[PDB]
Amino acid sequence: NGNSLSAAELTCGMIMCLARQIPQATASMKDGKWERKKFMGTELNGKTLGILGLGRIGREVATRMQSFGMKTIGYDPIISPEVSASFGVQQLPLEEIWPLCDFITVHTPLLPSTTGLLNDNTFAQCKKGVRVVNCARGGIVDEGALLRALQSGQCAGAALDVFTEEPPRDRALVDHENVISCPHLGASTKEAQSR
Amino acid sequence: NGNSLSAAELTCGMIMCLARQIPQATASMKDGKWERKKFMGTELNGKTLGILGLGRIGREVATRMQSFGMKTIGYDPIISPEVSASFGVQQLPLEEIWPLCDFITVHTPLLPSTTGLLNDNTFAQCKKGVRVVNCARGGIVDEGALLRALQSGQCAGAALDVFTEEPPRDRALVDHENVISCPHLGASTKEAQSR
Ligand SMILES: Oc1noc2ccccc12
Ligand SMILES: Oc1noc2ccccc12
């Protein structure tokens, strides 16, 4: 609400970080290395971003990423397709979303229907090399399934602000070379903090 | 041209990384830490972005950062104020730009007139806490002056894709906690590479 924009901005930051491996490149630089060929990335323009959860944060993410030329599609059980069209999000059923996306971002509450929304089944339906972002609630993305998808290359990268347990006690995700992370910083701006 | 969008996209990534310290937070997480107060950041909405160089890259940066609610102002001696108005950038003389900006990004060639465009004299005219990006040409930002500004806090952070010498032999900038960097990745996308 107040803090909608801080979350939406972090999410868009994470999308850009996944496309260009900025965190990993800075780490490489700080370790004294100049590794240009390693950190070959991708352009956002013309890519498809799937947005799962089309409330305020989802809508804000959409309109920012639309300025990058991304195609924004998505799904939300409550919001009508004509309403999401009005903010440039094409709604399709979930089963249709997975194979189209280059990037997926989640913006749902944590409910039975959204716990493990991304799981071994839904990762297998994605395009090989999909990049995922969770700046919403820990557990929306099944962490074990994510790890397996990163290990196989079915997922080329992931950005996590939130974890099933905080701080995460299992470190295998965090430590993966294709995972970027923050300690639940979505609301952590001076502005959000200070109404 | 071909590669305009890859440079512009990286620049926008770097601005979001400065606002939220994504690379430093990832490093902290990978070292097993959970440091929430350390990485309190700022919101981009409502802030002023100064764009120095209003050719194709500069214009693309402007229109993307406008979607975040940033006020975009700038300077370019060759681009008419009418042309820059067409993409929502108010041109002002340099002297008027420095004090207004929360963020500054450079998109000029390297010429006598732009070597040290940001230097001790122009840092001194900036708002305390300014954040700077150079994804254009190494030497636009004077490296010794940038280090002095980061040491005093006159500059709160900087993002560098390019250096006066590549790789930089002096590591004090790269090693600073408030500096984000990449090994000249601006054109390093699969797309740019493959027309
Ligand atoms: O409850 C939900 N809010 O947004 C969703 C998106 C996908 C599946 C379920 C939900
Ligand atoms: O000479 C210049 N080329 O582009 C510029 C932008 C700002 C200030 C000077 C110049």
User: Which residues of B are known to be catalytic?
Assistant: 137, 166, 184
From the list A167, A132, A163, the residue with the least C-alpha distance to A149 is: A132
Q: Is B49 helix (H, G, I), strand (E, B) or coil?
A: strand
Hey, what amino acid is at A152? Answer: S
How many CB contacts within 8 angstroms connect chain A with chain B?
Answer: 179
| Residues of chain A positioned with their CB less than 8 A from the CB of B23 | 17, 22-23, 26-27
Decide whether any atom of ligand 2 lies within 6 Å of the B108 Cβ: yes
Among A180, A182, A150, residue whose Cα is nearest residue A166: A182
Instruction: Flag if A35 and B6 touch (Cβ within 8 Å).
Output: no
Asked if the Cβ–Cβ distance from A166 to B34 is below 8 Å, we say: yes
Domains annotated for chain B, with CATH where assigned, are 1-195 (3.40.50.720)
CB of B122 within 8 A of CB of B96?
Answer: no
For residue A113, which atom of ligand 1 is closest to its CA? Answer: 9
| Method for structure elucidation | X-ray
Backbone angles phi, psi at B25, to 5 degrees: -65, -40
Q: SS3 for B91?
A: strand
CA distance A71 to chain B (A): 15
Closest atom of ligand 1 to CA, residue A94: 7
DSSP labels, B125-158 = TSPTTEEEEE-S-TTSB-HHHHHHHHHHTSEEEE
Which residues of A are part of the catalytic machinery?
Answer: 137, 166, 184
d(CA B116, CA B87): 27
Q: Are B45 and A10 a contacting pair at CB < 8 A?
A: no
Tell me the C-alpha to C-alpha distance, in Å, between residue B93 and each of A28, B59, B100: 38, 18, 12
CA atoms in the 13 A half-sphere facing the CB of A120? 5
Q: What is the 3-state secondary structure (H, E, C) of chain A?
A: CCCHHHHHHHHHHHHHHHHHCHHHHHHHHHCCCCCCHHHCECCCCCCEEEEECCCHHHHHHHHHHHCCCCEEEEECCCCCHHHHHHCCCEECCHHHHHHHCCEEEECCCCCCCCCCCECHHHHHHCCCCEEEEECCCCCCECHHHHHHHHHHCCEEEEEECCCCCCCCCCCCCCCCCCEEECCCCCCCEHHHHCC
